Design an enzyme around this catalytic site. Structure first.
Site, mmCIF file in Angstrom:
data_model
loop_
_atom_site.group_PDB
_atom_site.id
_atom_site.type_symbol
_atom_site.label_atom_id
_atom_site.label_comp_id
_atom_site.label_asym_id
_atom_site.label_seq_id
_atom_site.Cartn_x
_atom_site.Cartn_y
_atom_site.Cartn_z
ATOM 1 N N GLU A 134 24.757 9.638 -32.831
ATOM 2 C CA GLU A 134 25.985 9.009 -32.137
ATOM 3 C C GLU A 134 26.542 8.070 -33.235
ATOM 4 O OE1 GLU A 134 27.400 10.417 -29.604
ATOM 5 O OE2 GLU A 134 25.859 11.617 -29.318
ATOM 6 N N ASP A 135 27.087 7.102 -32.693
ATOM 7 C CA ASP A 135 27.785 5.813 -33.632
ATOM 8 C C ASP A 135 26.922 4.844 -34.361
ATOM 9 O OD1 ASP A 135 30.180 7.391 -33.595
ATOM 10 O OD2 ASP A 135 31.056 6.164 -32.105
ATOM 11 N N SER A 136 25.538 4.717 -33.982
ATOM 12 C CA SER A 136 24.913 3.628 -34.105
ATOM 13 C C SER A 136 24.533 3.572 -35.434
ATOM 14 C CB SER A 136 23.344 3.948 -33.036
ATOM 15 O OG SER A 136 23.571 3.853 -32.030
ATOM 16 N N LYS B 101 33.027 2.401 -35.786
ATOM 17 C CA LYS B 101 32.285 1.393 -35.151
ATOM 18 C C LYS B 101 30.903 1.918 -34.252
ATOM 19 C CE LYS B 101 35.064 1.979 -31.007
ATOM 20 N NZ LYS B 101 36.141 1.340 -29.976
ATOM 21 N N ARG C 209 35.790 12.996 -36.854
ATOM 22 C CA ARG C 209 36.810 11.637 -36.908
ATOM 23 C C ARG C 209 37.655 11.704 -38.100
ATOM 24 N NH1 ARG C 209 31.826 10.449 -34.664
ATOM 25 N NH2 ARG C 209 31.739 9.269 -32.690
#
Ligand SMILES: [Mg+2]
Ligand SMILES: [Zn+2]
Ligand SMILES: [Zn+2]
Ligand SMILES: [Zn+2]
Lengths: 404, 257, 115, 477, 51, 48, 67, 98, 34, 98, 44
Positions: free
Chosen positions: D204-206, D342, D375
């Site tokens: 994910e975004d981690s 982020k 993105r």
RNA sequence: CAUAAAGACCAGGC
């Protein structure tokens, strides 16, 4: 513990879990459970509800547990599937080319929880023992499961003539007697779709063993994913020096055609299509030409991709991204639209102060020639911001009406 | 069914650097040794900091933080000192600790630089690596800093201030025979310093029978331990762990049966 | 506030055994070792050394989770040979290598200086 | 227009408009019109000449400034509804010079186009290589980045003050940052970043942080909480008094420790205060005494930085006390790059386990590559390359949005000369086993911002505590 | 129809791939405050005297 | 021709609104008017 | 604020190399020459000096609490 | 007390008429970062209500070129209704047409 | 008397003078001052 | 003495105007602080520019369901010297009247 | 009880229930003079 | 073991 994220849209957003205590400050959960809650990890919080009675604990255990909730009654599809890294590494891991020496197989078998303890006999016995990705992944598939699916890149030619079952691209899929014979997995196989290998594992075997199917896939194919690794870099976003001239040739062709159509409309020679105002048929024609342009350049950029390029590795398996993103990166961003129409006139009969009044050409009305790699021009950047503002506004506005 | 017998070549030896080559060895032993260069090599770095008067514009545990990252000379007494956990007495004795004292005030108008050279130790063998000057803090006129510190014996697993080494370069199979990495276009990649090949050819031909040997190392010291004794201390510590496993392992096999 | 102190990594508190040994019923002549308070430093060594022994059919290790410091090493050997003996022999061989490497490294040091 | 360009009877503020088809002529002297300056073009040539730039480069000690450039009729203010009457050129050497004819009459040329971006959007390197929602997200997050906010912060008394230990000016910076004073007060730190899927904790975004860097002071910050306290006289004989309560004199008494207070009932600076610790003893004479004393926010666990005692508006004794706590970045904190990527920190690995190049460099921060494709932030990649060039060359690169003079290809050709693969791809060795990682991971320094959001303040746990008065239900907050 | 409730803990989530599907990482503070009410029997009285 | 779709059309359906934003009526033809565009054009004139 | 000891990535000591660094820049050498003269090779060290902002000279303007 | 009050609370108007009085003016300045402060000092606030789901008060209009930042805006009910200013933008302060 | 192809210096020198005379917040100060 | 007006920091009537670096350091003020805000009761407040429709100019709009096909209007003030506004509408009734 | 002045930085001795004005500078803001009892830090 | 009210607006998070 029952576990929650707001808002709860459907019943899969509340699922009972099994506590395990860990250090630091945060909740931690396996990532196949990502898709039910819609969660990503940036600043996301989730509520934790603890049943205080053995009676309600039994209710949660025999009703709301996660392994029981895999298949949704909504779409009669499985909710959870292989997502993010593990799906890409399943694709790359399931190719014929993947061969494994002895110790690597020792580790990958060491991370199988359901494994019998019997090392399979490798595909290549001599000169040196080599297991294959399909050969170890066949140890993941529980019981005896039977499935037939087709990989994304599978063409429709291989079905017509010879090589129906050979499939020179290794594509389609076959799973017989709990064993993977052939085929490359993708979003159409391990992912969430009707009749996917996971769904078949649920209905044919059960929830108990299906849970272990997920977990085993996750662990072993991550710990193998360490070996090859995955990345995106600028070399993945760059095409050949020939493909750039191809794309720019197509673009200049399209814009010249648009000039031809507009210069037709100035002389009135454009005949209105029945049911359309001259403006409607004009915008229709121009949209035809421009969409043909951006589509053709897209397909070209998708033909320019090497087998090693990582954009293709993410998009082909359907893990994340889509072909249109590769198109916007390599070739052309495309037409920008405000309220479903080509960029309007904010000023008096012109879009921006730079352009000349009554300019319907592709550049003035917001067609973006440049790509994100090469970077936008300023006016294309502002038109692009206008194009994104509508998306943000739709995102913000729709939620209230949908929830109500 | 026996351990291989390795070899070593030392190419460059300086006070900042060691380049040595281990041959006829496993990969795991190599990576584990270069790992012990970081993790398990004991060293002396300041741990316990007590501040009396701090008028500086930098708050207390910021300075107390920066005192722990100052290298101390570990070359000798580290073998002598004991871990504070294994020490007999309460608090601190000369066996488990080394006391540093800092007294500075700025009388003159010009800014004074408080540096490691101002740190004063009870024992001569530990200097703050001054035989330039590591800057602890700056002081305007009227500002004052006076503090006590006790430095202990620890290693890099605990906190990164106990890392004896800077970046440790590790390489094997510089010209790629083994194909442990596959270049999509091999002709775009510069060649390693250890490359054995002509500049017309990109790579070495594939060797199916080969396995990694001749591991190229570079060990760059932080100044606490001279780089010649970083490797010795590392191998000694790793060997000590293995001997411990043989010990308690043998005790368990004897006890359970 | 929930951060563990700098040592959960090696130091053992009351009651934890360094090594615990559990036989594996899935396969005959196979055993499982559990090493508390260690990580890949040691496990990679031991695994790579156990794969040389021709009598060892399976050798592997894993950390069940990084935030916990633990190692699990499964070993399967040939009949009439105990895997514990293979693990002991592995450690002894490892020491026999590391001592030799120390000595040759010292000879190399003394040679590089005025040699 | 002449009289405005000479500023005789007409202030440069006044806008004047001729709308030709409606025959009107408008003049607006009104207040509130938003207007921006522009260069003036006579025929095809700018009125800005070589002597103007010669005097403006010598601007120091010439007493010659922008106002004298406006008084020369070179630059002119134009507002919105006058822009409908104007023809603008992007850059003079492009749109002014002769080509296959588009337009002749151009009356103006923008100074530089990147000035269409606001303050928070001017810190984004290469904003045109990004999807616009990401420029927006970054304009939102850039406000929350920790740094040194004002240089006098040691004097100021403020609630909720975040400050970063080691701010760094970026390696890749926009030309406009100079005028945002972002060199003197940077919020963030540069870091070595490999984009890869490593152990699966960055999914994910981690983001996977190097722990050995966190122990060296990386993204380690200070948090100043301020506490206001008011002595007052309200009732006739009822007053409030600063003093140290005694175990049995006053009415309300909590088991928390009062022993840290001084003779006046105020903790001296330099004392460690934890949950329930009592900062300010305050009593109220009861018409014997009541304890209004103030407590810390629970669990903060920090040290009293500063204590000041004064007189307010009315003249009562009024005390402010600032406690500060140091926070080390956890695996719960939230980190964002400058392009809008982020995410939290999945976990921290020590320098041991971090993947290393041939040279021993290990990434401080690892981000998942799946962030890129949908993105569509390429300026993160391009930035990541330009920083890898800028660190070696000794120069701070120029990311200003539209150069046309900085290609990705030129950056690559500049990188390949220093001994690196020109695409930024670099061979990594696995941390754990030391084996090579088959694919070549993309490494480069990128500038990362710690964010105000931190898990220690977002964690809450509830078992049968205080209860609402009216509803007899648990409290809110 | 809805209300603020007890025995509920909110915090940030972080990915752990090493758990199973139905497990969850719980920090030790949230596990410290949140309690489960238990009944003492002849089976668990020893364990509960330990706790 | 355009049709309101998605959330707004779902509001028109769930609300059973009196006047939708885009009312539409599809018409099929039995005889030779269906296949031939001429008689079809005749019905096109008769329905408008 | 002030230059960190122990460069974040690798762990080399950059903390003592700031002052002298300025000296080089005060005379002739460009940053590329100064960082090589100080002996910082791998760029993780170079980004410490090159990207550093020194706020200590700003904080030393304000008079201290005690004279 | 009137100036101090209507600056203090942010409710803008007579305090007994505060129902009729507009609100949202004079928020507390954000000290998080010097960039956040420079942004909060340069800002626009549209009086149109936040709840309304109608678009195009909100969208990005061609007249916003160069005077108002296209990228920067809050996200929430406030998208497009709060507009930060571009660097070269200068608000005309007013004069007399004498 | 022209500045072709040297423009990248010119635009940033004139922007320099701009933000040197005024600053970012001048709208506030001019509003309150008038 | 009629009353006290709050002062905007660093404006012409503030005590911080005209002061160079050293003076602002002796006064414990940051030379970087842009100013342009208020200090009320210790808090720092920032008046936010409020968007409004321009005055004295004639407009023409068309509402969907109105009795009018076309509504022109002038929102008019005098000089800003006095009074909030006076709104006059001039509109054209729809010819669709049956 | 010693409060350091915020103007001339001259320590003054002052007692409870007294207005705060520092002698000779007439300045109204005092600071609390960092304590005696000693507090330990870890260099980590 | 009890007290810190409630409400209002504003900023922000997903
Ligand atoms: Mg989220
Ligand atoms: Zn001792
Ligand atoms: Zn470095
Ligand atoms: Zn005084």
């Amino acid at each position: 513990v029952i576990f929650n994220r707001q808002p709860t849209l459907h019943k899969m957003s509340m699922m009972g879990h099994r506590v395990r205590i860990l250090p630091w400050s945060t909740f931690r959960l396996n990532l196949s459970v990502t898709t039910p809650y819609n969660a990503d990890f940036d600043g996301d919080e989730m509520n934790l509800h603890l049943p205080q009675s053995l009676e309600t604990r039994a209710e949660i255990q025999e009703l709301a547990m996660v392994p029981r909730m895999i298949v949704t009654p909504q779409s009669n599809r499985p909710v959870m599937g292989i997502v993010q890294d593990t799906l890409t590494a399943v694709r790359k891991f399931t190719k014929r080319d993947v061969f494994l020496e002895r110790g690597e197989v020792m580790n990958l078998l060491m991370f199988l929880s359901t494994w019998d303890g019997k090392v399979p006999q490798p595909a290549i016995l001599k000169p040196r023992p080599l297991w294959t990705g399909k050969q170890i992944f066949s140890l993941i598939i529980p019981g005896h499961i039977n499935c037939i699916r087709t990989h994304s890149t599978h063409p429709d030619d291989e079905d017509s003539g010879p090589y129906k079952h050979i499939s020179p691209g290794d594509t389609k899929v076959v799973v017989e007697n709990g064993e993977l014979i052939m085929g490359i997995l993708c979003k159409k196989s391990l992912g969430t779709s009707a009749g996917s290998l996971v769904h078949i594992s649920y209905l044919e075997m059960g929830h108990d063993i299906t849970r272990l199917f997920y977990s085993n896939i996750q662990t072993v194919i991550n710990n193998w994913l360490l070996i090859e690794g995955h990345t995106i870099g600028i070399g993945d976003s760059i095409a050949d020096s020939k493909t750039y001239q191809d794309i720019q040739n197509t673009i200049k062709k399209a814009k010249q055609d648009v000039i031809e159509v507009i210069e037709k409309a100035h002389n009135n020679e454009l005949e209105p299509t029945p049911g359309n105002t001259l403006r409607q048929t004009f915008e229709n024609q121009v949209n035809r030409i421009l969409n043909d342009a951006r589509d053709k350049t897209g397909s070209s950029a998708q033909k320019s991709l090497s087998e090693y390029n990582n954009f293709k590795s993410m998009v082909v398996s359907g893990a994340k991204g889509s072909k249109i993103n590769i198109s916007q990166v390599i070739a052309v961003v495309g037409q920008q639209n405000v309220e479903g129409k080509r960029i309007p006139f904010g000023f008096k009969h012109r879009t921006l102060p730079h352009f000349i009044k009554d300019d319907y050409g592709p550049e003035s009305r917001g067609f973006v020639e440049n790509s994100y790699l090469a970077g936008l021009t300023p006016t294309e950047f502002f038109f692009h911001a206008m194009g994104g503002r509508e998306g943000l506004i739709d995102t913000a506005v729709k939620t209230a009406e949908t929830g109500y | 069914p026996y351990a291989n017998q390795p070899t070593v070549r030392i190419t460059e030896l300086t006070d900042e650097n060691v380049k040595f080559i281990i041959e006829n060895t496993d990969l795991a032993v190599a990576n584990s040794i270069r790992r012990v260069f970081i993790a398990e090599v004991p060293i002396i770095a300041i741990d316990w900091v007590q501040i009396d008067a701090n008028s500086s514009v930098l708050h207390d545990e910021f300075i107390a933080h920066r005192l722990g990252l100052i290298p101390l000379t570990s070359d000798d007494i580290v073998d002598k000192l004991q871990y504070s956990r294994d020490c007999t007495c309460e608090e601190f004795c000369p066996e488990c600790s080394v006391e540093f004292t800092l007294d500075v005030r700025c009388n003159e108008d010009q800014t004074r630089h408080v540096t490691s050279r101002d740190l004063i130790s009870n024992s001569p063998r530990v200097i703050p690596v001054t035989s330039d000057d590591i800057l602890i803090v700056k002081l305007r006129k009227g500002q004052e800093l006076r503090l006590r510190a006790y430095a202990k014996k620890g290693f890099g697993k605990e906190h990164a201030k106990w890392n004896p080494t800077a970046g440790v370069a590790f390489e094997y199979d510089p010209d790629n025979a083994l194909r442990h990495t596959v270049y999509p276009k091999p002709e775009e990649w510069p060649k390693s310093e250890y490359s054995e090949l002509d500049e017309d050819e990109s790579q070495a031909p594939y060797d199916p029978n080969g396995k990694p040997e001749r591991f190229y190392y570079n060990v760059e010291s932080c100044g606490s331990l001279r780089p010649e004794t970083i490797v010795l201390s590392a191998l000694s510590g790793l060997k000590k762990k293995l001997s411990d496993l043989q010990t308690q392992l043998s005790h368990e096999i004897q006890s359970d049966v | 506030m929930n951060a563990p102190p700098a040592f959960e990594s090696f130091l053992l508190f009351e009651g934890e055994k360094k090594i615990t040994i559990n036989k594996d019923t899935k396969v005959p002549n196979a055993c499982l070792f559990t090493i508390n308070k260690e990580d890949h430093t040691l496990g990679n060594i031991i695994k790579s050394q156990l794969l040389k022994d021709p009598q060892v059919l399976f050798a592997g290790y894993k950390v069940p989770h990084p935030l916990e410091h633990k190692i699990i090493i499964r070993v399967q050997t040939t009949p009439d040979y105990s895997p514990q003996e293979a693990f002991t022999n592995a450690i002894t061989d490892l020491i026999s290598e590391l001592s030799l490497l120390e000595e040759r490294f010292r000879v190399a040091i003394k040679d590089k200086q005025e040699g | 227009r002449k009289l405005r360009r000479q500023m005789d009877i007409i202030v440069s503020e006044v806008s004047m408009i001729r709308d030709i088809r409606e025959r009107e002529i408008r003049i607006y002297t009104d207040a509130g019109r938003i207007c921006r300056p522009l260069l003036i073009v006579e025929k095809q040539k700018l009125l800005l000449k070589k002597r103007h730039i010669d005097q403006l480069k010598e601007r120091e000690y010439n007493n010659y400034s922008w106002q004298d450039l406006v008084a020369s009729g070179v630059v002119e203010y134009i507002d919105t509804l006058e822009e409908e009457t104007v023809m603008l050129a992007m850059t003079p050497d492009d749109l002014q010079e002769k080509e296959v004819a588009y337009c002749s009459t151009y009356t103006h040329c923008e100074i530089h186009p990147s000035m269409i971006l606001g303050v928070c959007a001017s810190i984004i390197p290469f904003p045109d290589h990004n999807q616009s929602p990401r420029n927006t997200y970054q304009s939102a997050m850039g406000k929350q980045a920790m740094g040194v906010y004002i240089t006098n912060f040691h004097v100021r008394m403020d609630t909720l003050a975040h400050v970063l230990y080691y701010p760094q000016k970026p390696l890749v910076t926009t030309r406009s940052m100079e005028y945002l004073r972002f060199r003197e007060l940077p919020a963030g730190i540069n870091s070595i970043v490999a984009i890869a899927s490593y152990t699966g904790y960055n999914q994910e975004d981690s983001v996977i942080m190097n722990r050995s860097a966190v122990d060296r002071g990386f993204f380690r910050s200070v948090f100043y909480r301020s506490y206001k306290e008011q002595e007052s006289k309200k009732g006739f004989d009822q007053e409030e008094v600063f003093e140290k309560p005694t175990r049995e004199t006053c009415q309300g008494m909590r088991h928390a420790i009062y022993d840290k207070l001084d003779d006046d009932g105020l903790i001296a600076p330099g004392v460690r205060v934890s949950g329930d610790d009592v900062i300010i003893g305050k009593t109220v004479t009861l018409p014997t005494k009541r304890d209004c004393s103030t407590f810390l926010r629970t669990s903060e666990t920090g040290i009293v930085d500063q204590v000041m005692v004064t007189l307010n508006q009315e003249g009562y004794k009024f005390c402010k006390i600032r406690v500060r706590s140091v926070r080390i970045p956890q695996i719960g904190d939230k980190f964002a790059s400058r392009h809008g990527q982020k995410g939290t920190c999945g976990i921290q690995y020590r320098q041991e386990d971090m993947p290393f190049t041939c040279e021993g460099i290990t990434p401080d921060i690892i981000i998942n590559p799946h962030a890129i494709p949908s993105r569509m932030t390429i300026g993160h990649l391009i930035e990541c390359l330009q920083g890898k060039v800028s660190a070696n060359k000794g120069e701070i690169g120029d990311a200003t949005p539209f150069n046309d003079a900085v290609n990705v290809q030129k950056i690559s050709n500049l990188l390949s000369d220093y001994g690196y693969h020109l695409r930024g791809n670099e061979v990594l060795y696995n941390g754990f086993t030391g084996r090579k990682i088959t694919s070549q991971i993309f490494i480069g320094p990128t500038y990362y911002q710690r964010l105000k959001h931190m898990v220690d303040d977002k964690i809450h746990s509830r078992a049968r505590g205080p209860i609402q008065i009216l509803n007899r239900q648990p409290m809110e907050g | 129809m809805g209300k603020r409730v007890d025995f509920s803990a909110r915090t940030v989530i972080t990915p752990d791939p090493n758990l199973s599907i139905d497990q969850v990482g719980v920090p030790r503070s949230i596990a410290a405050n949140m309690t489960f009410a238990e009944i003492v029997t002849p089976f668990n009285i020893d364990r509960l005297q330990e706790l | 021709k355009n049709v309101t779709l998605g959330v707004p059309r779902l509001k028109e359906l769930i609300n059973i609104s009196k006047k939708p934003k885009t009312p539409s009526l599809t018409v099929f033809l039995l005889g030779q008017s269906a296949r031939d565009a001429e008689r079809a054009k005749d019905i096109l004139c008769r329905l408008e | 604020m002030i230059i960190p000891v122990r460069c974040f990535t690798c762990g080399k000591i950059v903390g003592n190399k700031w002052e002298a660094y300025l000296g080089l820049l005060q005379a002739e050498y460009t940053e590329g020459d100064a960082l090589d003269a100080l002996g910082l090779k791998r760029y993780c060290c170079r980004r410490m000096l090159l990207a550093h902002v020194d706020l200590i000279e700003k904080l030393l303007n304000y008079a201290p609490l005690e004279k | 007390d009137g100036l101090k009050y209507s600056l203090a609370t942010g409710n803008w108007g007579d305090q007994k008429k505060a129902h009729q009085a507009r609100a949202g003016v004079s928020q507390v300045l954000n000290r998080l970062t010097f960039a956040s402060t420079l942004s909060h000092l340069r800002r626009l606030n549209s009086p149109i209500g936040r709840d309304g789901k109608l678009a195009k008060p909100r969208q990005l209009h061609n007249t916003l070129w160069g005077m108002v930042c296209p990228a920067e805006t809050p996200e929430g009910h406030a998208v497009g209704l709060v507009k930060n200013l571009a660097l070269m933008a200068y608000i005309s302060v007013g004069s007399q047409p004498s | 008397e022209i500045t072709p192809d040297l423009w990248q210096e010119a635009c940033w020198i004139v922007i320099s003078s701009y933000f040197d005379e005024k600053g970012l917040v001048r709208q506030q100060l001019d509003s309150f001052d008038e | 003495f009629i009353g006290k007006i709050p002062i905007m920091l660093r404006s012409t009537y503030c005590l911080l105007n005209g002061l160079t670096d050293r003076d602002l350091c002796e006064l414990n003020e940051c030379p970087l602080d842009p100013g342009g805000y208020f200090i009320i009761n210790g808090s720092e407040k920032v008046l936010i520019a409020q968007e409004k429709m321009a005055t004295n100019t004639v407009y023409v709009f068309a509402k969907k369901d109105s009795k009018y096909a076309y509504t022109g209007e002038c929102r008019s003030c005098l000089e800003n010297s006095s009074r909030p506004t006076s709104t006059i509408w001039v509109s054209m009734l729809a010819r669709g009247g049956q | 009880m010693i409060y350091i002045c915020g103007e001339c930085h001259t320590e003054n001795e002052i007692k409870s229930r007294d207005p705060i004005r520092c002698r000779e500078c007439g300045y109204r803001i005092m600071y609390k003079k960092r304590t005696k009892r000693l507090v330990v830090f870890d260099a980590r």
